[PDB]
Ligand binder design. Structure first.
Ligand SMILES: O=c1ccn([C@@H]2O[C@H](CO)[C@@H](O)[C@H]2O)c(=O)[nH]1
Ligand SMILES: O=c1ccn([C@@H]2O[C@H](CO)[C@@H](O)[C@H]2O)c(=O)[nH]1
Ligand SMILES: O=c1ccn([C@@H]2O[C@H](CO)[C@@H](O)[C@H]2O)c(=O)[nH]1
Ligand SMILES: O=c1ccn([C@@H]2O[C@H](CO)[C@@H](O)[C@H]2O)c(=O)[nH]1
Ligand SMILES: O=c1ccn([C@@H]2O[C@H](CO)[C@@H](O)[C@H]2O)c(=O)[nH]1
Ligand SMILES: O=c1ccn([C@@H]2O[C@H](CO)[C@@H](O)[C@H]2O)c(=O)[nH]1
Lengths: 243, 244, 242, 242, 253, 242
């Protein structure tokens, strides 16, 4: 019956929904919809698990993207085909600034495009910027639930290891492009490393789709469980102010 | 004198943390005179600088001139003097059919069709405006009830070929920029201007807060009145109040 | 508990294994593992389901990579941390050549790097090339079972849609870089489109690891059972690389 | 007015086909005053224009302002008005230990460290001055007896990080320009400035003739920021191109 | 056009006698020596850096044609031979190894090249792999076993210069442009076997046009070792790699 | 026997020479050298044929470079090692402008860098500019010999065929980068295609060596695609720089 190639979903399945909360982990999908009205599992294929929920009478989608830009770009595109116009990304991130602690919540304004997929939508010249209303909603909801929040630039990498300048690896080597890259992003005022924002933000911003980015700090490079739900409450509360 | 170009000493600013930065040296005094105690400080090359006061706190109005290069001088030297927040007011060319001459555009981030931005950060780095500054600008525009569009701006190092203008001497647009206007349109870019990429990049990569606002003087879907200038000017000053 | 951050595995779970068949789909793991002796499930986290099996009394690994180079870079890296030196990828592909049909088996010599993750291991000048022994084992395993095989260059994209030049999408546009791209890879003799080989092949070739790639054709682009043949080939290839 | 920025008509030129183009608008009058019948034409933004007469021929003096963009406006609009020959006169920073403050530097071609040049020609294309324009400048310099150095000039879109200045607000320079001055120096580049790349590229690729000449005001092997032979040369050079 | 189907090489389709394989050395002087390992070799033409000979291998006609040093002259040779009817190109060259484990006199077979050249970009963008044909590489590896050489199979760095691109400081200048500064070490860590000057162009332009191409080279110097080989640095290193390229060609006719 | 690796020459062989005429054809070395006094053959190895000659009783070298940058970069570097500080290239060229004719002499000020070897000396931003004194003598020699001479930009390709947008080729196809590039170079006022100037000028300008570039038009590309003044000019130009 499916409308799209990967998600295994019809336009009818969205039930009029126009906004989607897009977490990375399939196992975090249900936990998010649970904070909303009438949650029901829609479909689960590959790393794309999807649920439908309700927020103030209007339908919303929660759908996982998986790790990295490519997988994300499949999800966002197919959700867009289905009718979704607003994308809210929740995820996890590693802070590169000393003042940001494990537990702090990060709202991304724009991202450093250290990926490949963004270039398949707009040339490097193009800014991987978030939607203004989405970011506003993400911050005003963050201030409203009493979260220690930092708003700024994120480094978005195609690799977990070398692109985020991790040295404790099989080779122990980091390619020239990324040698001392973290020290540079730090100096530029970049808050954090994650893997999906550059793709999400570029492909939405260059296709009239609205996207926001929020993430909870798991590790701090320079240096628990209640940490996560803050970003989960925020990404759900922000959704209400966007419907 | 403390800085090489602006001819300003730290004292001339006297505590000022924010600077409204127009393009035209002639547009400077006109903006400074919407605030309290407007005093001319210096004037050298294309950099004309005035000091005004806003709610009892000192503010700088300083022209950047045309292009990223001269912007990179004015900004750098104002930053040396203690300015931490920049609000650029400018003129702009709309490339979207729904944006009319007279409107106000608040730039979230800029398409880096320049060279100067690369001297601060590689191309991967976004040319994004400071969040607080964008908010101030948008809310200032909301209050005075101006027609406002918030989105992406194409920031070129040239007025003509980089903005795909053909009524030129050569009538030629180099491959890179041939058909590029139709491309920016499809991507949801609102406008062309010539400074934002440089300003927004050099600020977001050095801890400086920057905002971008511009009045639409032309719509590119048509060709290549006066309430346009003063509307964006009222906004940039109103936003300034809120970042002091 | 675990010697690696993502896979949820220890060196012990591998039992001395040095070869990993690396499929895309987690669902494909058990199937591939079941063509071998003593197949056992190891772990399953995110997009990485891992099984261990045996061939001629040698420990073999089957571990999924998910979609795209990013997650592929995680699996390969963490398998490298646990002892794997030979990586055989099996996947699915859309053939861009007119005379490569649905059901055909394709062995990748090297890949057109239309990805990001590979640049995190080597500059663009460096070739996304397969190991020769792996490629040899793959082609020879392919010909020994009679499958229609093609040996050549694969275009490896970071997107399923604009990078593989699909216009049949939400916006209907393809970025300038990729507009008319498929028609150019065609004349260059590129066989097919997929999404992982550029990363896999680059990160192995520049890090002293061995990698090979085989894929069954599910789509012919100039236009718009199959599974088990590539699966048989990848196991038969693995057999010849222990 | 026939042009958007300069505020000038073709008639203001009086058949002038040559424009001496300074950076600083406050220096236009001074150049024009060294010629016959100097008449102020217009002043808008950073563009101040004067007509002058030389050997009984109309010659424009019009300022460009700091940087490629502001220059690319002035040149284009002067070219629309009738100017076909462009001589830039400005200030520069020497990067060779043996170039003295006051020396005149003639540029043969420029290191394209700018952005505007790419809006006229791809990076492969040389930012090269016109031969006749360069000759006129060298021959003029040798006739007045100024200490003259002829060679390549690094043309940066910024005054500070692109010219590797460290006495800045942040005190940092981006990776690309970290140790870039030493490289230009080893390659025998004479000096830094901000307009020549743009001028020379946009002219040489549009059938317009351009020469470049500058006065040394600071030596970069000693200071970052400092504590008119150039002017006479650009006028005499113009005299020979009329 | 003094009886020539091509501009540079000075050859006609007839000169080839239906030869579809060409062994392509870099040095015009090496051409006669290589054809001398085959039956009925005859000089065809000699213009510029392109000296060509026809020989017979297991009864079938084969071309030996020099390319000259670098991608530009190689691309001319390959293109013009392809017009004449050549579909398979086997390059036999000399090389400098960069791995400590690769000794002088060793034989190296290239799977693919690091594109430090310019001419390859005239056939495909930088993302396209400078990969050798599978059958050509298979033929060379098997031929190496037949001759009994010490063989390594892997990635080669193909440079457009002999000096700064191969990070040689022993030059008039003594400087190396930022791009190639500390590059050899990086290639070493990336397992690159050797430096040479033609493979990247040959392999790209052949793989991107339906032509089969192989690459074999003999190590005449190791860039990490102190001791540099005697008068016959090439003489019997050539004899190994040349004997292999000819043997590989037998299995591609 | 030899102080250099390729040319087979010793510093003594040059007899104090500091200027070299560098043709691209080893067979044309003798002819060129034959126009001077005391022409002695020195060496022939690979594509590098080197003669010594005397001009106004001052030693001069004629050394072939072969086709392309790589081969040229070796010759120049090794001649430079042996004492040569001035290089004068004399090649054949294909004109891309309608007004330039078969037989016309083309003097290069600077080159469009469509090569790879130049990048081994300077980044792309650095201009491939000829030495001012070298060009001057070449233009002056051009007047002396009396020939239709054009001075300007040259497009310097790493291929005879696709980089010069030729279609009389095996495939009949040209890569995106160069498809429609010839007329693009036309509109930019580029005079001609050749294969060695970008490397020669870049490697000399960025290394403190003097370089000059002259050529004889053998084909006009607006009309077709395939098949001594320049020789005399490059010899007479040498006389002015010894
Ligand atoms: O420092 C970090 C912290 C978290 N992640 C997240 O972890 C996932 C990969 O495990 C990615 O989706 C990414 O969002 C990182 O990549 N880097
Ligand atoms: O279409 C337009 C309209 C206005 N401007 C503005 O006008 C100035 C130069 O004309 C620039 O600083 C820019 O802000 C443009 O660049 N393009
Ligand atoms: O035309 C195709 C056919 C299959 N795939 C494969 O399908 C997976 C995504 O569904 C990717 O990992 C990729 O290997 C493509 O990318 N393109
Ligand atoms: O060291 C120097 C000296 C002068 N200038 C010139 O001075 C003006 C701005 O200071 C610009 O036109 C620029 O070309 C520099 O850029 N760097
Ligand atoms: O260290 C070496 C040894 C040999 N060659 C080869 O020798 C020729 C030039 O000497 C070139 O064709 C090249 O392939 C090198 O480039 N580098
Ligand atoms: O159209 C032409 C004509 C001649 N040449 C010259 O001829 C030689 C190759 O035949 C090269 O040195 C090159 O400079 C070209 O490159 N293109």
């Amino acid at each position: 019956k499916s409308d799209v190639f990967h998600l295994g979903l019809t336009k009818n399945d969205l039930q009029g929904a126009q906004l989607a909360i897009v977490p990375g982990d399939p196992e975090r999908v249900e936990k998010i919809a649970a904070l909303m009205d009438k949650p029901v599992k829609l479909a689960s294929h590959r790393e794309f698990t999807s649920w439908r929920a309700e927020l103030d009478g209007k339908a919303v989608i929660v759908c996982s993207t998986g790790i990295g830009g490519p997988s994300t770009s499949i999800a966002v595109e197919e959700l867009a085909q289905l009718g979704i116009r607003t994308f809210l990304r929740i995820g996890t991130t590693g802070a590169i600034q000393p003042h940001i602690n494990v537990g702090d919540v990060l709202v991304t304004t724009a991202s450093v495009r250290l990926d490949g997929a963004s270039l398949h939508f707009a040339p490097m010249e193009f800014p991987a910027v978030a939607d203004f209303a989405c970011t506003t909603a993400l911050v005003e909801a963050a201030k409203s639930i009493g979260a220690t929040t930092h708003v700024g630039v994120t480094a978005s990498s195609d690799t977990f290891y070398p692109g985020q300048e991790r040295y404790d690896t099989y080779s122990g080597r980091v390619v020239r492009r990324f040698k001392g890259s973290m020290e540079e992003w730090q100096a530029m005022g970049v808050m954090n490393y994650e893997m999906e924002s550059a793709t999400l933000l570029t492909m939405c911003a260059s296709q009239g789709l609205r996207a926001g980015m929020v993430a909870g700090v798991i590790v701090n490079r320079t240096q628990m469980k209640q940490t996560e739900s803050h970003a989960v409450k925020i990404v759900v509360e922000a959704a209400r102010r966007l419907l």
